[PDB]
Every structure is written in structure tokens, then in C-alpha cells.
Design a binder for these strands. Structure first.
Length: 183
DNA sequence: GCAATAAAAGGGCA
DNA sequence: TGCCCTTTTATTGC
């Protein structure tokens, strides 16, 4: 499903799961060495494991957010590890409603892009204010994905719940990027 | 750095 | 209510 011949690399996956049990965040932050907590700043225990390299946000409600994985599977594995860490800490954690919430992929078309012309020709979807952010923000409607397009030809694709939406957004924009290649 | 992007979870605030 | 709290990742250019 890659007519362009380029496959965006998945860079970050954000997922959530329900441990399905109330948690004592202070007890976790004290029992765990690999855990940061200060409710004055944020309501979650921030934990990190080395493989898959991720960061979890564990809340008192038993709900948990997993960030930093390079794939959906790796995010699910990381999440299972935190839930087991939580269980070994004494809480009857379960593993329910695991869902992929956001997928960030990036790629390189390897040719310069004329961001102003592209923005202008696609005003309905584009936001280009280089003084604020040097990347053109392309809010695609089908699929509903947001792409950050840079002069260098590097592209950031975010907002997908499935990797296929990521791949399709890239394929949809490729013809457009080529059209505004900077010569 | 740090700017903006997307997304989730919660406590706090006006 | 709503919006930021924090975390992650790619990115260019100040």
C-alpha cells in the first residue's frame, strides 16, 4: 500500500489500558525505584522501562497511558510490563480495554518543498506561519490526519489510530509535495 | 533548547 | 465547563 515507494517510519505510539483497580500512587512511588511522583505537578506516577523503551503515566483510577513505543505491539508489551510491575507491587491489576490512541510516523521524500505555494494552493487545509513554526501544518480530512511538512522534505504524520491511516495520509500528500518541489 | 502537532489520562483553576 | 497540568516522538530555525 505504498505507491510512492516510501514507507513512513513509526516513531511514537500512545496507548491506554485499564488496570481495572484503584491504585495507591504514593505506595507505588515509594515501593518502586523506577517511579516519579508529585501530585502538585501532575496526577500520575511517571514510570519508565528500558525495553521496549517507554514511559507510562499511572493514575489512581487504575487507568494508564503508555508513550514512546516504536510499534503497536511494542506499546502493548510495554503496557503489559507496567501492569505486571504494578501487580508485583501488590495491586490486583488486570489488563482491559487496551487501545492505541495515537501514532506518530515520519519520513523523508528527499527533495525540497515550496511551503508557501503549497499552503496557498491548499488554504482549506494549510497553516503556514514560519515565524511561529517553520513547518506547514496540513490538516487532512480523509483520513483525519495532521502532517507537518518542512522545506527539507522531511514529513511528520500524526493523529492516527491505525498505521494504515498514517500510510494513506502520506500517499495522499505525495503527489502534492512533488508538485511543489523546490527547484 | 524552544517553537507546534496529535493523543490519552487527572487534579486544579477562573 | 474548558483548558492546562505531564509524557512521548518526529521536525527546522531561531
Amino acid at each position: 500500500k505504498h505507491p510512492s515507494g516510501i514507507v513512513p517510519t513509526l516513531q511514537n505510539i500512545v496507548s491506554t489500558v485499564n488496570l481495572d483497580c484503584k491504585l495507591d500512587l504514593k505506595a507505588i512511588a515509594l515501593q518502586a525505584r523506577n517511579a516519579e511522583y508529585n501530585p502538585k505537578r501532575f496526577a500520575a506516577v511517571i514510570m519508565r522501562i528500558r525495553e521496549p523503551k517507554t514511559t507510562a503515566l499511572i493514575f489512581a483510577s487504575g487507568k494508564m497511558v503508555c508513550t514512546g513505543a516504536k510499534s503497536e505491539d511494542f506499546s502493548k508489551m510495554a503496557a503489559r510490563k507496567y501492569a505486571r510491575i504494578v501487580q508485583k507491587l501488590g495491586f490486583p491489576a488486570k489488563f482491559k480495554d487496551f487501545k492505541i490512541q495515537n501514532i506518530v510516523g515520519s519520513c523523508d521524500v528527499k527533495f525540497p518543498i515550496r511551503l508557501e505555494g503549497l499552503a496557498y494552493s491548499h488554504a482549506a487545509f494549510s497553516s503556514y506561519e514560519p515565524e511561529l513554526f517553520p513547518g506547514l501544518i496540513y490538516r487532512m480530512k480523509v483520513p483525519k490526519i495532521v502532517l507537518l511538512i518542512f522545506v527539507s522534505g522531511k514529513i511528520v504524520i500524526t493523529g492516527a489510530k491505525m498505521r494504515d491511516e498514517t500510510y494513506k495520509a502520506f500517499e495522499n500528500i505525495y503527489p502534492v509535495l512533488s508538485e511543489f518541489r523546490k527547484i
